[PDB]
Each structure stands twice: as C-alpha cells, then as structure tokens.
Amino acid sequence: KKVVAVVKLQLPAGKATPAPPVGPALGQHGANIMEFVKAFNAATANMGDAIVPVEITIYADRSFTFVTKTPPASYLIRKAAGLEKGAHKPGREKVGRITWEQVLEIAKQKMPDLNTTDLEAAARMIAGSARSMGVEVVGA
Amino acid sequence: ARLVGRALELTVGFSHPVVVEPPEGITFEVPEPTRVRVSGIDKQKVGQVAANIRAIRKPSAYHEKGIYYAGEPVRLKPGKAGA
Amino acid sequence: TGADLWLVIRTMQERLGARPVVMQLPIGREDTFSGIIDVLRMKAYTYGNDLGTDIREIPIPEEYLDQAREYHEKLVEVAADFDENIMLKYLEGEEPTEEELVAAIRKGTIDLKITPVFLGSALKNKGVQLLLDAVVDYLPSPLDIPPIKGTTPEGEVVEIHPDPNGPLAALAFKIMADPYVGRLTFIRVYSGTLTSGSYVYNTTKGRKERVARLLRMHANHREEVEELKAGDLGAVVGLKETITGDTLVGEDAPRVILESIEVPEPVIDVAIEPKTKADQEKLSQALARLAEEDPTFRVSTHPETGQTIISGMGELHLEIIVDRLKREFKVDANVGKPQVAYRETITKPVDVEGKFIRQTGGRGQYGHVKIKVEPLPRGSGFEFVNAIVGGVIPKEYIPAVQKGIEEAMQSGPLIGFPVVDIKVTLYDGSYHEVDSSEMAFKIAGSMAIKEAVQKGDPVILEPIMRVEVTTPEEYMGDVIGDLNARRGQILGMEPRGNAQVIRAFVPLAEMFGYATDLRSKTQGRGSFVMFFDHYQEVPKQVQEKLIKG
Amino acid sequence: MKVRASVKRICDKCKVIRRHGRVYVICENPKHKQRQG
Amino acid sequence: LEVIKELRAITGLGLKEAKDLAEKGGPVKEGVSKQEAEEIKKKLEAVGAVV
RNA sequence: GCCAGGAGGUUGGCUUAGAAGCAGCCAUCCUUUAAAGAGUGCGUAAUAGCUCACUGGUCGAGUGGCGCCGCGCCGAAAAUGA
C-alpha cells in the first residue's frame, strides 16, 4: 500500500498523459493526473493553454490535491515584445523593442513569483533578463 | 562466518573453508557471519589484520560482494561494460 | 545456496503485478531441508533421504508450527475474495472445509488472479506428489476454458463446442520426423470424435488427408490406441501436406478453419553464403526441410545482390540452424553480414555535354544534348524538365533520351548504384532530319548523364532506420547510450506498460543485428522492431575508406 | 598514462607527495596513474 | 463497499481484523468534500462522522 | 578539518530529438543576502542528484601564492667479469 507523499510537477496544458514525471513520480499515489490537466486546463483559460507549475499530493485512499502557480516571464517578455521563436542570441541580434512601461506591467503581473515582494525590485530582475534572450529595451 | 573456539572460520566467495587465527596482541570476535568484529589492542597491529582480512577477500567486483571497513562500493556495469 | 520463498513472492509483483498467494512452506533453507509443511490440509509432510524412498507424516517439530498459521490465515483470507461462504465462515467462528476451499482456490486458479505457491527440489525427489495433487485439484480442466475460435467457410468466426459427439473439428501442432513411422504430426482435435483408418480434411491447405494410424507418445513407449476424442491431445501418424498451425475437420464435417494466427517476427538479419554453387541447391533443400518444422523465421535472398538472407528471432536459434545445416545437409556455410544499398548523388548544380555523331557516310547517327541536371534533397524524386526551345531536338527523340539517362543511372560512375533524388532537367540540344536516330539520342542522354555525375561530385547515400525499443527505464537509459553510440541519432520515448519506447534514427550498417546487442544493454527485458525512412550522406570519412578494389 | 615522463597534476585529486624517488600521480579512477619510468 | 472502491486495501486487506470491526472514520465538508458523505453516511452505511 | 546557511527568476537566449551551471556558440545577470555563481568537478539519456565556490559557527597561531639560486632527482635499456 501507499501513504501520504506530496510530490510536485512541471507540466504545460497540452501534454495530458501519464508520462514522466507524470506517472512514476506520482505512481505511488493513484494520482488522478487527468483530473489535474482538466481542472487546470480551463483554470488558466486567460489564454487557453499556458505552461504552469503544479503540486499534487497523495492521501492513501486515492486522493489527489494539486496547487498551482503562474506561467513564466520567459514568455511574458517575448509575448511583451513580439519576438516569434525568441531572439537568436542575447548580446547579439535584435527583433522587437520593449519600453519602460511594458517592462513595468510585466514586473507587475507576476508579483508573488519572481523573487521579492517589492514592485520596485523584481522589476530590476526583469530589466536584466530581457537582454539575455536577444532583445533591446527602450530607456529614458 | 563462525568463529569456532579460537579459530575464525569462513567460506565466502571461495571454494574451501578459511581459518583466520589470533596473533599476539590482538583478538577476534564474531557476532555473526555477515559482520565480524575485532577486539584488537594495538592500533598498528590491528589495522594490519583489518586490511589483511579485507585483502583475503577483496570486495568491489564492479558492483558488490566482499568485505568492507565502512567501505562503499564504486559503481560499474554488470552484464554490460563489454563492447 | 540462495534458496528462498519471500524473494520469489517479491519479484513476482515487482515485475508483473500478479498476486501470488501460496500453499506450502519449507523446513530449512539451502540443504537445511528435510521435509515440507503445507497449509492446504495442514499436514506436516516430510520425506527423509533425498531419493525419497522414505516419505512420512511425522509431527510438527515446533519452530515453524505457529508460523504456518499466519499465512494459513492469509490463505484462508484470499478464499474470502471468491467463495463467499468461506468468507463469513472465516470471519465468524467456524472452519472452512477441505473441499469447497478446493473450489474457491480453483476458482482463483482458473480466473488467473492468484498463484498457489508450490515449489521444491526434485533433484532430491521432494515436492513432487504435492504439486501433482495441486495440479489435479486446481489446474483448468478442458471444460471451463473459454472455447477456441474458427471462422465458418463464409467469413465469420465460430466457436468450437467440445462435445465428443458433434462435428469433428481438430487442431494440430508439433511436427517431428520419426525414422520409424515418419512425419509425426502432433495434433489436438477439438469437437467430434477422431477415429482410426478413416480420413480428415485439412481446411487450411484444402487437402483431404488419410489417418494411417493413431498415436500418442507415452514416457517409455508408443501409445497406439484407436480413438482421440474431442479436445484430447496426441499425434497422428502418416499425414503429408499437414504441418504446424492447422485445422482439420471430419471428412463431411461443417469444415471450418481455426484461428491460431500468431506474429513473433525474426529480429536479427544474418547473411549466409556457403562457398561454391554446389551448396546453393543443398541450401534450397535446407530451408525446404526447415519451414515445415520451423515456420518461425524468414529467408529472403538480398533483393539486389546475392546472399540469401537468413533472418531469425535469435542468434542462438540462427546458430543451431547454422550448425544442423553444416552437419545434417553438409552445407559448409560461412555466415557473413548483410550488404547495404547505397545511392549515388551529386552536390553542385552541374550541367555538362553529351554528344554523339559518326559520319562515315549514311547512317552513323546524330546526337548532341546539353542538360540541366540539378539535385534534390535525399528523399524527393527522379525528374526531368523539357526545356526545349523551338523543337530543335524533335520531341520524338526526347523519349529514349530520358531512359538513356535512366539506364546510365542504374550503375553510377563510382561504385555503380541507382542515382536517386537528383532532379535532372535538360535544355539545349540539336538534330539532323535523318542521322538522328532513337538510340543515338538514347546515348545522348546516357553519356550526358555520365559526364554530369563524374564531374558533379557524387556522394554516397545509405539507409536510415527507425529503431523503436521497449524497455524498463534503467536499461532504457543505458540504451539511449547504445543507440547514440551507434552512429546516427535516436528520437524519443514514451511509457508503454512497464516500459519506455525509443523512437530512433539508425543507419543499418552500424545496426547489424541489434537483438542480441539489445539484450545486452537491456539484459533481455527489452524489445524492439527496426524500420525505414530515407537515405543520407555518410559523414565523409567512409567515401575514402570504401574506395575498395 | 602509466609510465610516462609527464607526472603533472592531472585530475585535481591526483597528487605528487613524492615517494620511492620516482613520482607517481595518485588519483581515484586509476586510468589516471602516471609514473616515472 | 468503501474498501474495494476507495480504500485500496482491496477487501481482505482492509477487513482481516473484521472480527471486532477495525474500521471507523471519514472526512466531510460541502460540495467539495461532502459528496462522499451523502455516500459514506448515506449508501446503506453508518460511519456517521460529523456531517 | 569539524556543525550548518550553500536561493529565485531559469528550462539564459541560442542550438539540439532534449541540453536545465554541466555538448557547447554569444555569454557578459539583477533581486531576496551576514553569503549563494549564468558556475568547479562528480552524476544524467537531457533533468533530478552530488558538490565546490563564498558566509557564519568552533578553534587558537601563524599562512598560501608568486619570481630566484645551489646541490641534488626522474628522464637514463646492449651485448666475455666488476
């Protein structure tokens, strides 16, 4: 038999199968992983899909409990600039500009994530990371 | 293993039995087959015997099988490792 | 040494998931064995000496006496999952009897959900009659076994009703060759009654066969009787065409074909070429005298060059064959490895000349053509592009000009192999109202092509395969190892059952027989397939080594 | 690597605490055992 | 009933000690954790928790 | 040395079947911090993991690293007895 084992996963809303780390990380569970993709599919229906972090717990009698978090800003800077596949090399090529507001709204939306809980701080962490993916920023 | 009276006997990964027996200064002590103990009163003459029983049966063998100080196996391939 | 109980019970469900549930326990492990306790009747069984001329039922010497109880309970416990009489009659107060438990346990032992654990060392005449008893009292009678199937002569599967008093329908199986009687054809019947001196109609081969005599084989002699009834099992003597995997019926019976269609493929593809030509014929005789007894492997002479491909499900298999071969028939076979099919292909857009013409007065034939011969990706298709301007080359000379190309592409300028995916084209030629023959411009296209490839940098193509492997995770990892360490690159994976697939690109040259190599990084527990996709350039270094004489 | 005139300090566990008058290079995976011979 | 459907102690596993009834318990809320209280407490059953 | 703190965005972008400090090409961080890297090795099928780096806890007196010289030493096996 099996007892309480809280194990978390990292899964996008598009690959709904018992495939590692879906299965064996939550095999000692009877983890209803198809009721996790479904209860979370329409949950982040602010776009339809999005990639999202999760955490599903077993309680012996086939009990599954998943807690979730937001998508990334390695998609909220690329969706914040009009960069298609991305931007081939950081300190090299350029594709689609960002400004002092776009970066601000980005820094906003994802508040409890990033690292700090101070809007005038995580925003800096954003002010950097944009450069490491191949895009410029508009300063003033 | 089974220390009869004064003699330490064992038939490990070898055909015939083995007779390991007391030298001056130190003493054996078998708790059971799988974890033999030694009351050796001579830090120099004792470790000698330690690494000498361990040399009697060198462990490792890619995976496991053998005698260990507190020794930990160092991993390699079984029915593999043979291109 | 290493004897057990527990560990068997563990790995059973650590690899398959089938619950054992058990019927007896040892008296001492490795050689500490004297007799055997059981938990069925709860009687202290015991032999004495190994040969077992001195069995007994002496009292329980204590030690494990109590321990039998717990598992006994467990035994009884699982009896409460089937026969729900023993259920209350074990969870109330009374006792389960020595009889209805036989049917609870046989229930479990025909539903396939439980696994009465009897064991033992019959080296030393122990554990024998016990397992025999268990066998009679539990093993699935040919009664409750869900009936076999065999499509009517109309096109619809039909059930066999195993009454020895209905239509005579019969299956066969094992084909021996017995220097006394002969082609021993081991058969199991089904419905109706099998008589002697009668006749049978094998529905599969459509041939009507003659029962020369009846047979079963005992342990020490030939069991020659007269009749084998519906679903009784044995062997028929004297029956030619019949082999393994068949369906015979009564001479006038409803006449159907039993299913019994199976699929295990031959994995390893070996090559065999036994010296001269004096062998090839005897080899025909060999693979002849095989298949009827060995319908399990496949023989396909390399559909391009020589080498009869001998493909089988295992290196051993293939080797007991390669051995009986060299002994029974004599075939001094020198087994080699399969060739490959390579394909010439240029690199740069090269456009050369192919002229002809011979003037010694009269018919000497005219034929000047210059063509585009551009290339295509290593999977496209053979082409040509009518780039004729004013009809300079009279269109009617275009036909054979394209085959002269096509047949000067049969054998390239290098090794001599089918040039593929080289979108040719054409453009500018010439003519003469008379001299220009059909074969002349045939040669125009031909030679033009030849120069085009000789100059255009032809590199060598090679088959790229799809290996798709079944494996339990660990092996899976080290097999990602093996695969990528086999030249080309793999692809992916998925969890299929207790396994993980392996999608894989693999050039056949470095791939030659992977089954035995598979079972070395999977250590047996792996399976796979191999298939095809396209051809590709060798990473250069093989076109300087393969300049072989 | 065994017996070759370069007894440097290869895999950073390998040591040269000179013994016997002919430096060995002592490591873990003993495909890394250079010697002075 | 609640031993072959939920409590993965199949049946004999969860009721080997059933001589003195070694099974009494169950959680319950509303809409979220209650639907198995109109089953645990109402389905020919009597493990009356709180709700 | 000993007990421990040894982060987050991130899965850097590229590329790749995937590449997470770990195959590498351009790299060329900022915030939480007394400290924690676009990273040192181990591990992997790529992760996970292991681990170092830096910082404190103990301890109590010295300590690494770089240029130089003299003797050494290895490199250094041939043939009737030294």
Coordinates of C-alpha atoms in Angstrom, one line a residue, chain A residues 2-124:
Chain A
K2 CA 0.9 3.7 0.0
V3 CA 0.7 6.7 2.3
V4 CA 1.0 10.5 2.2
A5 CA 3.6 11.6 -0.3
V6 CA 3.4 15.2 -1.6
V7 CA 5.1 15.4 -4.9
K8 CA 5.1 18.4 -7.3
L9 CA 5.3 18.5 -11.1
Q10 CA 6.1 20.9 -14.0
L11 CA 3.6 20.5 -16.8
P12 CA 2.1 22.5 -19.7
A13 CA -1.6 22.4 -20.7
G14 CA -1.1 20.3 -23.8
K15 CA 0.6 17.1 -22.8
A16 CA -2.0 15.2 -20.8
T17 CA -0.6 11.7 -20.4
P18 CA 0.9 9.5 -17.6
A19 CA 4.4 10.2 -18.9
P20 CA 7.4 11.0 -16.7
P21 CA 7.4 12.8 -14.4
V22 CA 3.6 12.4 -14.6
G23 CA 3.5 8.7 -13.8
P24 CA 6.3 7.2 -11.6
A25 CA 6.7 10.5 -9.6
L26 CA 3.0 10.2 -8.7
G27 CA 2.6 6.4 -9.3
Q28 CA 2.8 5.9 -5.5
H29 CA -0.5 7.8 -5.3
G30 CA -3.1 6.7 -7.9
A31 CA -2.7 10.4 -8.8
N32 CA -5.7 11.5 -10.9
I33 CA -3.4 13.3 -13.4
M34 CA -6.2 13.5 -16.0
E35 CA -8.4 15.4 -13.5
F36 CA -5.4 17.7 -12.9
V37 CA -5.0 18.6 -16.6
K38 CA -8.7 19.2 -16.8
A39 CA -9.3 21.2 -13.6
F40 CA -6.3 23.3 -14.5
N41 CA -6.9 23.5 -18.3
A42 CA -9.9 25.8 -18.1
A43 CA -8.4 27.3 -14.9
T44 CA -5.7 29.2 -16.8
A45 CA -8.2 29.9 -19.6
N46 CA -6.9 33.5 -19.8
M47 CA -5.3 32.4 -23.0
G48 CA -6.5 28.8 -23.2
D49 CA -3.2 27.0 -22.7
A50 CA -0.1 28.4 -20.9
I51 CA 2.7 26.4 -19.2
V52 CA 2.2 26.1 -15.4
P53 CA 3.8 24.7 -12.2
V54 CA 1.8 22.3 -10.0
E55 CA 1.9 20.2 -6.8
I56 CA -0.1 17.1 -6.3
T57 CA -0.5 15.2 -3.0
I58 CA -1.4 11.6 -2.3
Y59 CA -3.6 10.6 0.7
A60 CA -3.7 6.8 0.7
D61 CA -7.4 6.3 -0.4
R62 CA -6.7 7.6 -4.0
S63 CA -6.8 11.3 -3.0
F64 CA -5.1 13.9 -5.2
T65 CA -4.7 17.6 -4.4
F66 CA -2.9 19.9 -6.8
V67 CA -1.8 23.5 -6.1
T68 CA -0.6 25.8 -9.0
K69 CA 1.4 28.8 -9.9
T70 CA 1.6 31.3 -12.9
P71 CA 3.4 30.9 -16.3
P72 CA 6.8 32.5 -16.9
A73 CA 8.3 35.9 -17.8
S74 CA 10.5 34.0 -20.3
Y75 CA 7.2 34.2 -22.1
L76 CA 6.0 37.4 -20.6
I77 CA 8.9 39.3 -22.2
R78 CA 8.7 37.5 -25.5
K79 CA 4.9 38.0 -25.6
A80 CA 5.8 41.5 -24.4
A81 CA 7.9 42.4 -27.5
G82 CA 6.6 40.5 -30.5
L83 CA 9.6 38.1 -30.7
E84 CA 8.5 34.9 -32.5
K85 CA 10.6 31.8 -31.7
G86 CA 12.6 34.1 -29.5
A87 CA 15.6 36.2 -30.4
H88 CA 18.7 34.3 -31.6
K89 CA 21.5 35.2 -29.1
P90 CA 21.2 37.8 -26.3
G91 CA 24.1 40.3 -26.7
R92 CA 23.8 40.0 -30.5
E93 CA 20.6 40.3 -32.6
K94 CA 17.5 42.4 -32.1
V95 CA 13.9 41.8 -33.1
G96 CA 11.2 43.8 -31.3
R97 CA 11.6 46.6 -28.8
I98 CA 10.3 46.9 -25.2
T99 CA 9.8 50.1 -23.2
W100 CA 9.7 51.5 -19.6
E101 CA 6.0 50.6 -19.3
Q102 CA 5.9 47.2 -20.9
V103 CA 8.6 46.0 -18.6
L104 CA 6.7 47.7 -15.7
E105 CA 3.5 45.8 -16.4
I106 CA 5.4 42.6 -16.8
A107 CA 7.1 43.2 -13.5
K108 CA 3.7 43.9 -12.1
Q109 CA 1.5 40.9 -13.2
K110 CA 3.9 38.4 -11.7
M111 CA 4.3 39.8 -8.2
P112 CA 4.5 36.9 -5.7
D113 CA 6.7 34.9 -8.1
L114 CA 10.0 36.3 -9.4
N115 CA 11.8 36.6 -6.1
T116 CA 11.0 39.6 -4.0
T117 CA 7.6 41.1 -3.0
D118 CA 8.6 44.7 -3.8
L119 CA 7.4 46.1 -7.1
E120 CA 10.5 48.4 -7.1
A121 CA 12.9 45.4 -7.1
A122 CA 11.6 42.4 -9.1
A123 CA 11.2 44.9 -11.9
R124 CA 15.0 45.1 -11.9

